Amino acid sequence: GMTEYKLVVVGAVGVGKSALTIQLIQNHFVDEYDPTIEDSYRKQVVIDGETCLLDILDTAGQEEYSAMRDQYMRTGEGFLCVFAINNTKSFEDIHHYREQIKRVKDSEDVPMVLVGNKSDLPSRTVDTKQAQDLARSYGIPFIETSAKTRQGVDDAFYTLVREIRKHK
Ligand SMILES: C[C@H](Oc1ccnc(-c2noc([C@@]3(C)CCCc4sc(N)c(C#N)c43)n2)n1)[C@@H]1CCC[N@H+]1C
Ligand SMILES: Nc1nc2c(ncn2[C@@H]2O[C@H](COP(=O)(O)OP(=O)(O)O)[C@@H](O)[C@H]2O)c(=O)[nH]1
Ligand SMILES: [Mg+2]
């Protein structure tokens, strides 16, 4: 049967979680997507010759630590932690997202990729070395992406699927 992988995209508002998701789903860059819409989207993709079913939860909205929201995020098997390379605050937020993922998954070993989005822009404020070094601290991959040009998009999502397989 076809394996389904539940992937969750997290990070500060405005980093491009929806744009990255919709590039994967629609193969189109969408510069405008209601910042409050949290939803999940499925797509069949071939990864290393295996057709699998991706179910991608594009997170949005208010930070809340109810049992319900914890259980919703707990369904994720792997997480993309996204910051924007021209937004230092979004990078400084990453450790909080990672903390919460470890908490709800009750594991120090959750499949996870650090994603530096908006790589097409010239306004870089987060050095690549600093982001690579944070991924090294966590023992996870770092992928540079642009939802606008498609740079890194498959690499980010497909790496997460490969991590989920290894973890199994
Ligand atoms: C960085 C923060 O800001 C925001 C703003 C919006 N969201 C968050 C946020 N943190 O984790 C999460 C997720 C969705 C991540 C996956 C696992 C779980 S489990 C659960 N219950 C979640 C929730 N809500 C989450 N989201 N944080 C700063 C710092 C603290 C105060 N705050 C102003
Ligand atoms: N140049 C550029 N803009 C992007 C990129 N990804 C998202 N954006 C823009 O960043 C803003 C927020 O994107 P959105 O997908 O709504 O972010 P979300 O709140 O994380 O879902 C919008 O103005 C998008 O057009 C990218 O890779 N490059
Ligand atoms: Mg969004």
Residue numbers in the entry: 0 to 167
Article passage:
Extensive optimization led to BI-2865, a derivative with a prolinol substituent and a pyrimidine linker, which enabled a direct ionic interaction with E62, as well as a water-mediated hydrogen bond network with the side chain of R68 and the main chain carbonyl of Q61. We established high-resolution cocrystal structures (1.0–1.1 Å) of the pan-KRASi (BI-2865) in complex with several KRAS variants. These showed a conserved binding pocket across variants defined by the α2 and α3 helices, the distal portion of the β1 sheet and the distal portion of the Switch II motif in KRAS. A part of the KRASi pocket overlapped with that occupied by covalent G12C inhibitors, such as sotorasib and adagrasib, with the notable difference that the pan-KRASi engaged the pocket without relying on a covalent tether and did not extend in the P-loop channel near the G12 residue. By comparison, the affinity was 60–140 times lower for KRAS variants loaded with the GTP analogue GCP. Selectivity for the inactive state is probably conferred by the conformation of the Switch II motif (including residues Q61 and E62), which partly occupies the drug pocket in the active state conformation of KRAS. As a result, BI-2865 inhibited the proliferation of isogenic G12C, G12D or G12V mutant KRAS expressing BaF3 cells more potently than precursor 1 with a mean IC50 of roughly 140 nM. Last, the inhibitor attenuated tumour growth in mice bearing KRAS G12C, G12D, G12V and A146V mutant models, without causing apparent toxicity to the mice (at least as determined by monitoring animal weight).
KRAS mutations are among the most frequent gain-of-function alterations found in patients with cancer and their therapeutic targeting has long been a key objective in precision oncology. The KRAS GTPase cycles between an active (GTP-bound) and an inactive (GDP-bound) state. Here we report the discovery and characterization of a non-covalent inhibitor that binds preferentially and with high affinity to the inactive state of KRAS while sparing NRAS and HRAS. The pan-KRAS inhibitor works by preferentially targeting the inactive state of KRAS to prevent its reactivation by nucleotide exchange.
